[PDB]
Amino acid sequence: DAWEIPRESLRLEVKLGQGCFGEVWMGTWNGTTRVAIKTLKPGTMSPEAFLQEAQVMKKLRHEKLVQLYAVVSEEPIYIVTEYMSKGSLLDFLKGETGKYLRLPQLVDMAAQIASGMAYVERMNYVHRDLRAANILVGENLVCKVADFGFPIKWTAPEAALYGRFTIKSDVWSFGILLTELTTKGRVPYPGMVNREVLDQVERGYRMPCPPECPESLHDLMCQCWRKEPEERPTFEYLQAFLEDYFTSTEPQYQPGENL
Ligand SMILES: Cc1ccc(C(=O)Nc2ccc(CN3CCN(C)CC3)c(C(F)(F)F)c2)cc1C#Cc1cnc2cccnn12
């Protein structure tokens, strides 16, 4: 058991999520420390399929990966975790302060995610659904990699077509996630339906450079979007590249209207 707790500890205060097969609540733990809860909506998935997520989350422990705190085996099940106060990043980028973000805050932000995924990469694990809807945000623009568990527009074409879901198909996704950041949360492949994406991309189409995104950064995304998984960069290299960007790659970056 080890991470099992009682319902006596917890209190589910305001419903923040409304998942495929569950819900998500702000709360309080042992009446003191403020946490988040995944509640299985009963019948649907059962304590087998749902509770392999707590297995996986037990082994990972990293400063950019949402931290498991506790579990509740006896039904209804509450999977418990730290609370990211600004929520999902897609929400944050679309919300109040999205308009004030410039490219040093987005690229800093990006480097934290790459950090988390490098740790994921080190453990020989695949995420499978890397994107702005699976990144939570707390104060001071701290981002962490989360999971809320199909998206053609984020999934690599070798994983979408043939199921080769490797670390390097998360590398692909990271490049797309980068375009979300640089457009402020806009959906990939504007106007193009799932079917058009595959076909065009399959035939070499990549997203053009976002307006006011320098070309150096657009060369990074295309690096993630190479046709051969093994020629994609790595999260470590991407981490460093993003960390060093304004000294080593854009020292004449000058902020403008949007970025
Ligand atoms: C309550 C809660 C419960 C569970 C999870 C969760 O499922 N996390 C998770 C699951 C799996 C994986 C890794 N696998 C990927 C798949 N892969 C195939 C295998 C490995 C990881 C990761 F950390 F590794 F990324 C995280 C997140 C939250 C949240 C929250 C929260 C906190 N503040 C707010 C504010 C607004 C909204 N939500 N929220």
Residue numbers in the entry: 261 to 409, 427 to 536
Verbatim from the authors:
c-Src belongs to the Src family of kinases (SFKs) composed of 11 structurally similar non-receptor protein tyrosine kinases: Src, Fyn, Lyn, Yes, Blk, Lck, Hck, Fgr, Srm, Brk and Yrk8, all of which share a conserved arrangement of four different functional domains, named Src homology (SH) domains as well as a regulatory c-terminal sequence. In the current paradigm, phosphorylation at Tyr 530 by c-terminal Src kinase (CSK) plays an inhibitory role, while Tyr 419 phosphorylation on the activation loop plays an activating one, although neither of these sites exert full positive or negative regulatory control. Here we show that c-terminal Tyr 530 is a de facto c-Src autophosphorylation site with slow time-resolution kinetics and a strong intermolecular component.
We solved the crystal structure of a c-Src KD construct (aa 252–536) in complex with Ponatinib at 2.49 Å resolution. The crystal had two molecules of c-Src in the asymmetric unit, and in both chains, the electron density for Ponatinib was perfectly defined with full occupancy. The central part of the activation loop (aa 410–425) was disordered and lacked electron density. The imidazopyridazine core of Ponatinib rested on the adenine pocket of the enzyme and formed hydrophobic interactions with residues located within and at the vicinity of the hinge L276 (β1), L396 (β6) and Y343 (hinge), forming one hydrogen bond with main chain nitrogen of M344 (hinge). Another interesting feature of the crystal structure presented in this study is the arrangement of the two molecules of c-Src found in the asymmetric unit, where the back side of the c-lobe of one protomer faced the substrate binding area located at the base of the active site cleft of the other. The interface is composed of the αI-I′-helix (residues 512–526) of the substrate molecule facing toward the αD (residues 349–354) and αF-αG loop (residues 460–471) of the enzyme-acting molecule with a total surface area of ∼1900 Å2. A close-up of the interface showed that two acidic residues, D521 and E520 (αI), form a salt bridge with R463 (αF-αG loop). In this scenario, both molecules adopted a disposition such that we can visualize the c-Src c-terminal Tyr 530 of the substrate molecule positioned for ready entry into the active site of the enzyme to undergo intermolecular phosphorylation.
